[PDB]
Every structure is written in C-alpha cells, then in structure tokens.
Amino acid sequence: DRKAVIKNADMSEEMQQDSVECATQALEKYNIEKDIAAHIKKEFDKKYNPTWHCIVGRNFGSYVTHETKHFIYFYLGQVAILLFKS
Amino acid sequence: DRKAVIKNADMSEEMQQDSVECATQALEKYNIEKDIAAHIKKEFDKKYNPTWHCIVGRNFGSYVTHETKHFIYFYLGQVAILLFKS
C-alpha cells in the first residue's frame, strides 16, 4: 500500500525487511503514531531482545546513540519511522 | 521568546529547567531539528553523562525505554522536544 523507502540503515538487511514489515503491520492495525511506535518497539523487543526505541511521525529530527547494526530509518508512504537499540 | 510547556517529566525539576534552557539555546543557535536535537543530546551527554537521546519535531509519536528520573517531553512554542537517557 505505502511505499517503503529506507533512508539510512546500520542493520542486517534481514532485519531491515523485518523492520519494514513489522511497521507495515503497525500501520494496518494502528492509526496514531505513538501507538504505531509502541507496536514496533514491543515487537522488536520480542523478536530481537531489548532495548529498542521507536519514533513515528511526519516532521522530526533526531540524534541518538544506537548499538552498531541496530539502527534503521525509513519512510512508509509519507510517514517516517526511526527504530534503534540503545 | 517561545512558550515552554512541560507535558510529561520523569526528572528532577532542576534537570527540567536545565533541559528547557539547553533547548532554548539550541533554538537560538540552530534552525533545523536534527541540529537542535544534536545540541541537546551532546550537552546532556556532557552535563549529565551518557547515554541520552533527543527528538525534536512538530509531528511524531514515540515509545522508548528510559532510566528512571531521566525523561522529559516538552514544547517550545510549536516545537516538541523529547529527551531521555537509555
């Protein structure tokens, strides 16, 4: 439905496809950004162990510290998702 | 200049005023959100030890895991800032 565009990833490309998919699911289930973000953080906390953090929104800038190979930042249609492991 | 409104804080109110001030400085120096966020994260990494993470923007939702008494989420005029320690 929404065009996934990965803009920056320090992350195995298996995990990338999984990120993009887990976030497709979040957008199919939830309409509000904080609820989308919660679905992805909790799914990644489960599928890949903690501690992940997730920001979903249309206008934001970020600066964060993420364990190597545990960062991704992609759009889904207009909505941008930031997902990373402390 | 911009009206600070703290919307949620798990944080000593000393640190809260410092957060709000460090972010006032960021908005006086930088115009782009990722650059504002970088100024606050780095200043907090310095003034309070790592590891902090910072999101600055007008439209986003979040879900994150933060050490207790190391979270704040406030507006500055229209711009919302999220600052927390992994």
């Binding site: 964060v64 510290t65 190597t68 | -």
Partner: peptide
C-alpha cells in the same frame, strides 16, 4: 559498541 546517528524528515 556504540555509534551516533542523525535523522531529519523531508
């Protein structure tokens, strides 16, 4: 190990 990252929405 750690690494720092920056993002900006378009």
């Amino acid at each position: 190990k750690t690494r720092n990252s920056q993002t900006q929405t378009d």
